[PDB]
Amino acid sequence: LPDLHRELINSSIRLRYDKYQTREAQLLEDTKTGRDVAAGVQNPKSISEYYS
């Protein structure tokens, strides 16, 4: 019993530490959306003749 008690508390910090990592990671993704991917196309003359 006290063998498995020590590993259980030692794995509940890692479960809570890996949760905090995703909340900081997917608030950076929420800023990445925008015009990060807009200045990637190398076809700029046809996409201004189409809109005009």
């Binding site: 196309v41 076809n43 046809s46 996409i47 003749e49 189409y50």
Partner: peptide, 13 residues
């Protein structure tokens, strides 16, 4: 889909 925008232009001309 926006890469070409080539064969979609002369059907608006």
């Amino acid at each position: 889909k926006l890469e070409n925008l080539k064969d979609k232009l002369p059907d608006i001309k």
